[PDB]
């Protein structure tokens, strides 16, 4: 039952590269968010002391 197959896809390597691109875009967005968050903590600390 492993020899009853479907049709082979076309232009595979382009599809794989597109997928990798999407993953990288998401990771970049998350990194931007974290870098933004850290400054908030610093600011809050100083403000409450004052």
């Amino acid at each position: 039952l492993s020899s009853i197959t479907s049709g082979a896809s076309s232009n595979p390597l382009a599809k794989l590269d597109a997928a990798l691109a999407d993953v990288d875009t998401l990771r970049s967005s998350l990194g931007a968010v974290q870098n933004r968050f850290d400054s908030v903590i610093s600011n809050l600390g100083t403000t409450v002391t004052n």
């Binding site: 970049s28 990194g31 974290q34 870098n35």
Partner: protein, 49 residues
């Protein structure tokens, strides 16, 4: 003048200690891992490349 109900130097030093703590943590991590970009927080543009 002399007040005891609140002390304002200790707050400043407590605030001023975390800044060093963070750099210590980063330098510790890089040594063990072996490389500079451990997450996209470091720099996103180089990670993709």
């Amino acid at each position: 003048a002399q007040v005891i109900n609140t002390n304002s130097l200790s707050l400043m030093t407590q605030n001023n200690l975390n800044t060093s703590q963070s750099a210590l943590n980063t330098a510790i991590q890089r040594l063990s891992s072996g490389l500079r970009i451990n997450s996209a927080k470091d720099d996103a543009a180089g990670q993709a490349i």
